[PDB]
Amino acid sequence: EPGLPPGPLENSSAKLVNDEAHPWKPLRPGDIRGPCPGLNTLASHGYLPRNGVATPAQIINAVQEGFNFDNKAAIFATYAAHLVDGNLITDLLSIGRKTRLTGPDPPPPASVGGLNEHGTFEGDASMTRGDAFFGNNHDFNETLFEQLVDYSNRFGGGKYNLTVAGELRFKRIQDSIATNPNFSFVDFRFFTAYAETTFPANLFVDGRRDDGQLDMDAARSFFQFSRMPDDFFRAPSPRSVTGVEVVVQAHPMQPGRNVGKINSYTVDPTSSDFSTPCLMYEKFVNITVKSLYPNPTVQLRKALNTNLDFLFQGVAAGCTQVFPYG
Ligand code: HEM
Ligand SMILES: *[C@@H]1O[C@H](CO)[C@@H](O)[C@H](O)[C@H]1NC(C)=O
Ligand SMILES: *[C@@H]1O[C@H](CO)[C@@H](O)[C@H](O)[C@H]1NC(C)=O
């Protein structure tokens, strides 16, 4: 029942993706949008179902076709999200809030909470979304976006680029340390927090230019309105995180968390970091996934095993597959 992960694009050239077949349309009542401007934009152009509920294969196809996200990155991100936020029996994932549209729920402690669920995939120090502690981890936030604009003005000549990314990533960390007593910055989120800052430079820049300089009109169009610029061409080749090394080198951090009070950031030696990427995969499967499904029945175990094989297809060569359910 779970479809096979799509393979890479047969033709990965730049092309018009804001085309007649994929027009932007406003949200209808019930349409779900969430913390990811990429998926949101794909849904609002009909690369994904416009109500924001999709299969993993639909998501992989959409991120490749609409933005030229590369295949391994698409597979890893999509199956990680599906394993912790999606319905494994119906093969459906919400790109935002929890919804009955993903079908009958599995037993607790699984939450099938969509991408909005804090602490499974989604986490703190996002760029244009607030921390979950402050009440809303998914809607566009104007104040946070205006800080992104200010950091683009100060470090990118008015454009968002990897230098801006390195300064803003660290600012959002510092602000969470100072204000969120529950701030968590370990393991999966420690990786995605750096990766996500490269995506506007690598994937929201029109592919005919591909110069890594994102202007603020296009930025607002994607980040707030889920809308491709008029005449938007996708990137001219598959990519995801290239340049993340610049973001890390700007302000190298250790994984850690506040310990129930502000300004109490405490390094966690059990966390993976960029020196142990295989450990991040192993903890995601052995701890995060297994904690949601500690003792699955037969149909759920088979769906878990299938999606865990698919997830491993997106893991970088050199890691070893782990089997929490045999
Ligand atoms: C392949 C499947 C994808 C999944 C499952 C996914 C999921 C998510 C989630 C859950 C977040 C919230 C992260 C957090 O708060 O910890 C996020 C953030 C983000 N995603 Fe995606 N995403 C995907 C692909 C893409 C693509 C193709 C783009 C194209 C640019 C993109 C751009 C972004 C950006 C820029 C952010 C950061 C938003 C912010 O901090 O303001 N994502 N994604
Ligand atoms: C947006 O973010 C600001 C700054 O962190 C916060 O004070 C505010 O409550 C957030 N929510 C809005 C503006 O709806
Ligand atoms: C970002 O833009 C600023 C100003 O144009 C420039 O000095 C810096 O080199 C740029 N960084 C990248 C990674 O393009």
Ligand SMILES: *[C@@H]1O[C@H](CO)[C@@H](O)[C@H](O)[C@H]1NC(C)=O
């Ligand atoms: C994950 O579990 C496998 C056995 O299922 C084990 O070999 C591996 O060391 C574990 N990794 C962890 C706990 O990080």
Ligand SMILES: [Mg+2]
């Ligand atoms: Mg977040």
